């Protein structure tokens, strides 16, 4: 039938058109992992550069929405830039009319509504990207919120994305069962980066380089990105543990 081609219910009450949107984020072979540190939130993610003729410095899956909130995207790159733009406009919007920078929580909720609106029309294609927003807020503390094509969102202790993300998830769950708290204790954010890399290497079974990773760090009142050199520093510190 044609309840699978436009976003109208079936005799099960299911929107098949929407479900397909999830099925496309595995096609770029990008994984991400994001954990809440002690005073930071770190997200490490794969960077695929299949050629020389692609310049690696430009291949970015990390878009700064706010000064304080980073966004890492898993899935097709057109929809990524589209989603980034909407989110950037809305963050600025709220700063203008409410006199402070938009909460991470409220931004996640916002994109969830817009996602629902793209599945409310019957000629609009859902934005298939899965979005991770990472922040350190001053009211909610360290935060991860992952929104999805359907327009469902929920908070997160930690999260992973990609075709191979079950393995990553298994690792993280076991860690927080030994530690019995919802965020990694350490006290230098640098060592939380190092820890995150170790779990990733275990999960995907591959050691990464400084151009197989791209790393984003949110500390208090800020988000920035590590350069490829900083990442190589971390991989020496794997030796040092």
């Amino acid at each position: 039938g044609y309840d699978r081609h436009i976003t109208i219910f079936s005799p099960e009450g299911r929107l098949y058109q929407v479900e397909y949107a999830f099925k496309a984020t595995n096609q770029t072979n990008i994984n991400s992992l994001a954990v809440r540190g002690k005073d930071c939130t770190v997200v490490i993610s794969q960077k695929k550069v299949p050629d020389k003729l692609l310049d690696p410095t430009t291949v970015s899956y990390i878009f700064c929405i706010s000064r304080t909130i980073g966004m890492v995207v898993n899935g097709p790159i057109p929809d990524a830039r589209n989603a980034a733009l909407r989110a950037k406009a809305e963050a600025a919007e709220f700063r203008y009319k409410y006199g402070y920078d938009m909460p991470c929580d409220v931004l996640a909720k916002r994109m969830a509504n817009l996602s629902q609106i793209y599945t409310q029309r019957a000629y609009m294609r859902p934005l298939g990207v899965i979005l991770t927003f990472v922040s350190v807020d001053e009211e909610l503390g360290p935060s991860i919120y992952k929104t999805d094509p359907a327009g469902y969102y929920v908070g997160y202790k930690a999260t992973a994305t990609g075709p191979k993300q079950q393995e990553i998830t298994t690792n993280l769950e076991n860690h927080f069962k030994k530690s019995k708290i919802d965020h990694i204790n350490e006290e230098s954010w640098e060592k939380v980066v190092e820890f995150a890399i170790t779990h990733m290497i275990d999960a995907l079974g591959t050691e990464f380089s400084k151009n197989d990773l791209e790393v984003g760090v949110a500390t208090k009142d800020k988000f920035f990105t590590l350069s490829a050199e900083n990442i190589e520093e971390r991989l020496v510190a794997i030796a040092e543990q």
Binding site: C64, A84, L85, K88, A92, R95
Partner: protein, 196 residues
């Protein structure tokens, strides 16, 4: 109200009063007019309070989005947004804005925006009501490329005369220093520049 900013060697220092009049009643005398629209480009408000605050909010909204997509704004870039909103309300809004900032694309810069909206680069800028009486002192005593201390004392001296001759300029003198050494807020209490 008087505002000024003056370039020096290593960056730029912004200087303002904190007294705001409407009529003969002083509404408040400790309101800071030094406003942050980027970490590194600040600006100075003078004239009618509402007009300048409104425009300043709009510009911050636009510059935020600039950073998150295209990279940080330059001092130039920022001045234009103030300018162009004043050009769209040139028959309605009377605003004196000085936009000054320290870049590494351009070291220190002073741009100023009149009521009707034009941008003007100057090695020093003055604007307001009370800063027109200190105008002649400004140019006769100005020096190109001074020491940090020399700049701090120049702004202190200019605004002392301003407070002298204008009852709408008063309170504390507030300064922000923009540099590659940090960002230094300074405050001078009245006895401290009355000695001089």
């Amino acid at each position: 109200t008087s505002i000024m900013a003056v370039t020096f060697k290593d960056g730029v220092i912004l200087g303002a009063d904190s007294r705001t009049t409407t009529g003969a009643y002083i509404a408040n005398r400790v309101t800071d007019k030094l406003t942050r629209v980027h970490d590194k480009i600040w600006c100075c408000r003078s004239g009618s309070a509402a007009d300048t605050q409104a425009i300043a909010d709009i510009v911050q909204y636009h510059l935020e989005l600039y950073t998150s997509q295209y990279g940080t704004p330059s001092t130039e870039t920022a001045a234009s947004v103030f300018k162009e909103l004043c050009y769209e309300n040139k028959d309605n809004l009377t605003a004196g804005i000085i936009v000054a900032g320290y870049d590494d694309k351009n070291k220190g810069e002073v741009y100023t925006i009149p009521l009707g909206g034009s941008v003007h680069k100057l090695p020093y800028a003055i604007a307001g009501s009370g800063s027109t009486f200190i105008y002649g002192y400004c140019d006769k005593n100005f020096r190109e490329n001074m020491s940090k201390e020399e700049t701090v004392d120049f702004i202190k001296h200019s605004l002392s005369q301003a407070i002298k001759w204008d009852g709408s300029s008063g309170g504390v003198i507030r300064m922000v220093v923009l540099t590659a050494a940090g960002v230094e807020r300074l405050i001078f209490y009245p006895d401290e520049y009355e000695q001089l």
